């Protein structure tokens, strides 16, 4: 709910336009965006190319890493800098198995062979990595390393700023739509946005555009609907902006049905990675049963995915869901037994690990430490409740939803290159348009280091694309003006109809952003496998969801906004609605349940490797208002065995 202190209204024709011409435009200054800005600045010199970074907030703390992070979740270690060395083949296997068999191995292997270099640079730039007395990076699990990352984003932000220059970074500018080449219907030409600090419409003209807006949250009703609706596990700052503008431009989406349901400390959603992997904490149900044991047999039907190590996250979630459905809650993270076991009676050792435990929270999800403080929970004395949050859509973490992107020429098989007009690393099906981090689908487990890395990869590819193809996109001035009118329409609608009621938020001719969002969340929660149905859905529910989303979409044409802040909220809602529609259509298309634990199609309860071991890709045609789906069979690209 939003109650503005005062009005801040503007009519489109009263707002000045600022035109910015650049070569490479990066939308989103988070981890992937900063990686792209950093790398782009390096190669751009070859053509004296201009690189521009646009961020809706402030790069110093914007995005998922605003609080910092307690670990770097992706570090292969090909030389032995950490406590455990790994191979690229094992990593690729790991990711494909976690995806229950569906991952673009050309893309995963690609970021994997580059990620360690990125991590090494991070340390070079000042990031303190936990080290053993011998100087080795401290491992959390097999693929992550612990870090003192409270300032993780500010450090990465400084690197990006130093590389591209502050004069090339636009902050507090919300991008709401892409612009296509007047000369080519399947080529990008820039993007439009508006400032949230003053009345100013932005028109960015570019030869290459890179989507780095992060994923999408608040599509689904959370487990807390009051103030805590703000405590989303994934970044509340990411609202599916890249998904919206990219899909509207005609860029194909992939695996958009693949949401991620995070099992974390209840309510605060504090991290469990260190507790499980580092502190060796056990999770038990209300009766003291360690369900990863009692529910192990139930995974036998998922051969050979259920035999993988570690066990695929969705299957781990599935075990949790079975406990929840059986009514065995609360589920507890027994931190008290974990700390006692690790300390071994050594009081000084206990103090040390105790400090490590709190840093794991204070370095990335302070709310959990605050929750413990408010509820008088001392982890050395009593266990904490854990629970799965509502669904989130992103492609950098454990979820792989995002755009279908091209891979490196030396790894991408012919089977995966068919839909790309131009073969450039991380380019979408739309010429000149790239997608990275959460925006790039089918290659998850990138996390902070991998996302920054994918950004670097796309940036170099963007410079290569520009110097080789030599594009010269022309924006359509008529479309730009149309978009400018649409941009501020909500403010004009508020002014035009507010007089119908004595209350600004109860009007029959318009809906405010928070009102449309409440509606979106209820629809998705009840029909799209949200928490309301313990992540279950079927054809009928999904079809009803499309019907309700249709009404909502029509009502977006009657959105109102009272100030610039709410105008951004209005467009963030628009972005989420289309993201939600794509998600529902993807879930409706795939007739199987491959990721039990993330969602269940009760009408197709089994995993089908005979007919569905494929990536589901879709394209939305704005002109015809039609969605087209395609199945791209998975092919093993990298050598590995179960």
């Amino acid at each position: 709910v939003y109650y503005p202190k005062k009005y801040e209204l503007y009519k489109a024709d009263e707002v000045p336009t600022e035109v910015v011409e650049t070569d490479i435009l990066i939308i989103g200054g988070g981890f992937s965006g900063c990686g792209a800005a950093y790398e782009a600045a390096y190669w751009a010199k070859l053509g004296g190319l201009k690189v521009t970074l646009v961020e809706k907030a402030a790069v110093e703390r914007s995005g998922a890493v605003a609080q910092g992070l307690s670990a770097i979740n992706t570090y292969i270690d090909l030389t032995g800098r950490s406590e455990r060395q790994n191979t690229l083949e094992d990593y690729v296997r790991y990711v494909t198995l976690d995806m229950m068999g569906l991952a673009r191995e050309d893309l995963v292997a690609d970021y994997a062979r580059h990620v360690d270099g990125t991590v090494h640079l991070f340390e070079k730039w000042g990031l303190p990595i936990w080290k053993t007395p011998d100087g080795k990076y401290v491992r959390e699990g097999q693929w992550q390393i612990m870090i003192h990352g409270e300032s993780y984003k500010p450090i990465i932000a400084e690197a990006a700023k130093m590389a591209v220059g502050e004069e090339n970074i636009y902050e507090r500018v919300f991008i709401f739509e892409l612009l296509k080449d007047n000369n080519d219907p399947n080529a990008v030409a820039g993007a439009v946005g508006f400032s949230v600090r003053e009345p100013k419409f932005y028109v960015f003209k570019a030869k290459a555009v890179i989507l780095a807006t992060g994923g999408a949250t608040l599509l689904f009703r959370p487990r807390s609907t009051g103030e805590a609706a703000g405590r989303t596990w994934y970044a509340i700052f990411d609202t599916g902006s890249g998904y919206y503008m990219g899909l509207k431009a005609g860029a194909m989406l992939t695996q958009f049905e693949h949401r991620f349901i995070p099992f974390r400390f209840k309510d605060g959603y504090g991290p469990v990675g260190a507790w499980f992997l580092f502190f060796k904490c056990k999770a038990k149900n209300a009766y003291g049963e360690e369900y990863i044991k009692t529910r192990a047999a139930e995974l036998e039907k998922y051969k050979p995915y259920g035999a993988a190590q570690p066990i695929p996250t969705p299957l781990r979630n599935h075990q949790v869901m079975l406990e929840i459905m059986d009514g065995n809650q609360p589920i507890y993270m027994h931190t008290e037994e974990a700390l006692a076991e690790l300390a071994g009676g050594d009081k000084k050792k206990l103090k040390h690990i105790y400090e490590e435990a709190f840093e794991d929270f204070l370095d990335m999800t302070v709310s959990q430490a605050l929750l413990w403080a408010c509820q008088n929970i001392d982890p050395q004395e009593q266990p904490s409740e854990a629970a799965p949050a509502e669904p989130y859509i992103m492609g950098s973490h454990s979820g792989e939803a995002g755009f279908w992107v091209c891979g490196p020429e030396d790894l991408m098989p012919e089977e995966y290159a068919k839909l790309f007009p131009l073969k450039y690393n991380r380019m979408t099906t739309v010429k000149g348009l790239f997608a990275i981090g959460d925006c790039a689908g089918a290659n998850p487990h990138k996390f902070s280091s991998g996302s920054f890395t994918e950004g670097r990869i796309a940036a170099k590819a963007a410079v290569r694309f520009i110097l080789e193809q030599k594009p010269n996109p022309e924006i359509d001035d008529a479309v730009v003006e149309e978009l400018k009118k649409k941009a501020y329409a909500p403010m004009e609608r508020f002014m035009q109809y507010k007089d119908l009621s004595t209350a600004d938020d109860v009007n029959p001719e318009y809906i405010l952003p928070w009102q449309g969002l409440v509606r979106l969340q209820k629809i998705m929660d009840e029909y799209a496998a949200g928490i309301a149905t313990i992540y279950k859905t079927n054809e009928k529910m999904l079809q009803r969801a499309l019907e309700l989303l249709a009404f909502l979409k029509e009502d977006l044409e009657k959105l109102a906004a009272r100030d610039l802040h709410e105008l951004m909220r209005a467009w963030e809602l628009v972005h989420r609605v289309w993201t939600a529609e794509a998600h529902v259509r993807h879930m409706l298309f795939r007739k199987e349940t491959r990721w039990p634990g993330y969602y269940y199609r009760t009408d197709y309860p089994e995993l089908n490797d005979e007919e569905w071991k494929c990536f589901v890709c879709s394209k939305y045609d704005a002109e015809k208002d039609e969605w087209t789906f395609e199945k791209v069979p998975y092919v093993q690209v990298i050598e590995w065995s179960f």
Partner: protein, 149 residues
């Protein structure tokens, strides 16, 4: 969500920018030109990331846990420096915990993005190598990955 302490807030004296308004990733912190004091304009959209809290030069911003699940009384107070950050965690029951963690091993603003890197070349632009590679990877050569036979 975050909230501003009126007694400590000075609406950011004569500095060039309002710290909290400048840093908030969700555009929640803003100034009440009348009081010349800041406030969170939409608390149910607060991620409780503590960015505003850390950047307020007057330490006038605190966080009061979301009412949905937070009993009154708890608090986490950071004192961020240049190389480390201190935290004080106060429990509803009076318990007080103090911690201090490193945050950076080098001086702020000292990053040299491509330090030691060779200049880019058109030839290199066509390879799979990113800036600094394969040297920064630490391996004896660019990492190779076995393709499925």
């Amino acid at each position: 969500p975050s909230f501003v302490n009126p007694e400590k807030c000075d609406g950011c004296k004569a500095l060039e920018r309002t710290a909290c308004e400048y840093i908030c990733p969700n555009d929640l912190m803003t100034l009440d030109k009348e009081k010349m004091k800041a406030y969170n304009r939409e608390p149910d959209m607060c991620w409780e990331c503590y960015s505003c809290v850390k950047m307020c030069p007057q330490g006038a911003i605190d966080v009061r846990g979301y009412v949905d699940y937070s009993p009154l009384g708890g608090a986490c107070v950071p004192m961020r420096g240049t190389s480390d950050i201190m935290w004080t965690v106060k429990y509803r029951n009076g318990k007080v915990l103090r911690f201090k963690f490193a945050i950076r091993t080098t001086p702020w603003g000292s990053i040299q993005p491509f330090e030691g890197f060779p200049e880019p070349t058109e030839e290199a632009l066509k390879s799979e190598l990113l800036a600094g590679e394969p040297e920064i990877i630490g391996t004896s050569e660019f990492p190779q990955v076995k393709k499925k036979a």
